[PDB]
Amino acid sequence: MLKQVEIFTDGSCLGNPGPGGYGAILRYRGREKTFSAGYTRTTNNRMELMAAIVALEALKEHCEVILSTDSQYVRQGITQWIHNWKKRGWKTADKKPVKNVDLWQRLDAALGQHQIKWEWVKGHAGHPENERCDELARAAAMNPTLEDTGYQVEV
């Protein structure tokens, strides 16, 4: 029994947008929790966020979290877009609101609580768990039971 929070994210977006969702294998207090929703129209990028976010949100106590994934949206988004955006002051180059700021904020804001362990894995030394994450994703992709509400930024 691993006494640690785990967030293995794996989106289930077939299109872009498309009828998909987001599935992630959570490992919480002596209880493996799963989060596999089903949207109608969303992007893989967003869905990936939804996985990381919902997982974090699911936590009923901001405690150590070890995230595992291999998403570019996150890789760059985090250690490229947020590094610049945040620094600048969560703003764009031409002074504007960030895309998917709501979900981003939830993440960034959430990350700013517990010990984040970004487990970046390539497409070679991948684990079976990750594969299972994708499995759950696909299962969700073929089981829409929600709606993409936060797919706009009217501000």
Q: From CA 103, how far away is CA 149, in angstroms rounded?
A: 11
The residues facing 69 across adjacent strands are 120
Distances (CA, A) of 70 to 10, 60, 75, 111: 9, 26, 7, 17
Q: From CA 56, how far away is CA 62, in angstroms rounded?
A: 8
Spatial contact of 92 and 139, defined as CB atoms under 8 Å apart: no
Site of tokens 């993440």: 107
Site of tokens 């089981």: 143
Residue 48 appears among annotated catalytic residues: yes
* 10 known member of a binding site: yes
Q: From CA 150, how far away is CA 10, in angstroms rounded?
A: 19
**In CATH, which of 2.60.200.20, 3.40.50.800, 3.40.50.880, 3.30.420.10 is domain 1-155?**
3.30.420.10
Chain breaks in the chain (C to N over 2.5 A) after: none
Q: From CA 139, how far away is CA 24, in angstroms rounded?
A: 11
Strand order in the sheet with 116-120: 31-38, 21-28, 5-11, 65-69, 116-120
At 63, the amino acid letter reads C
Experimental method: NMR
Residue 124 appears among annotated catalytic residues: yes
